[PDB]
Subunit: 115 residues, 2 copies
């Protein structure tokens, strides 16, 4: 499970010229990237004593323990991520794809900070 | 939200010639088309005067009331449905995709029977 590669796959879909297929595939890739992301934070945090038993906690953890800089947007992403399974609603699909480009910026940031 | 419509969205992605983006989008259209499917059984069961709290309970209930015929593949789908988030692993995505054409036959069947 490589984070650097999951990002590469998300970026990929995000550069293509949008249509419903590339859209959904972007959303799809957004989810598994987020899974590897928070697990990353987890492992990192646990390494130094702290404990994260859930994504939000891993976000909150990284925020205090330095790592990621105070960005209320991460919590915003977490919220979108819970909707991916309700995208049978095409408007919600669009509403989500609209924020992926930013979400990508955050992931690219985490990759950097993890040195 | 229409199940019949969500099924049509899956069919579409399945007819198009394959590649990564289409692959991933078919997975994502499965992630939600399945969510509507169990929420549709739940509703049906409720109207039947029964109770179903979870996806499995709903599928088991479907078999009991005689809506759907005995088919162990429905549980395999649920097992697949819960792996979408572990798609950062491409060997898995391919494993899921391969089973989608079968899953579509079953969704179309459910739709046909709710008639």
């Amino acid at each position: 499970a490589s984070l650097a590669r999951a990002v590469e796959r998300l970026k990929a879909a995000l550069e293509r010229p949008k249509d419903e297929f590339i859209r959904d595939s972007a959303i799809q890739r957004f989810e598994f990237t987020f899974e590897l992301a928070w697990k990353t934070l987890k492992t990192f945090l646990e390494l130094q004593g702290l404990e994260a038993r859930s994504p939000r906690a891993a976000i909150r953890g990284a925020f205090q323990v330095g790592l990621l800089p105070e960005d209320p947007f991460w919590l915003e992403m977490l919220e979108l991520r819970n909707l991916t399974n309700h995208t049978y609603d095409e408007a919600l699909a669009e509403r989500i794809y609209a924020e992926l480009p930013k979400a990508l910026e955050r992931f690219q940031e985490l990759l950097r900070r993890l040195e």
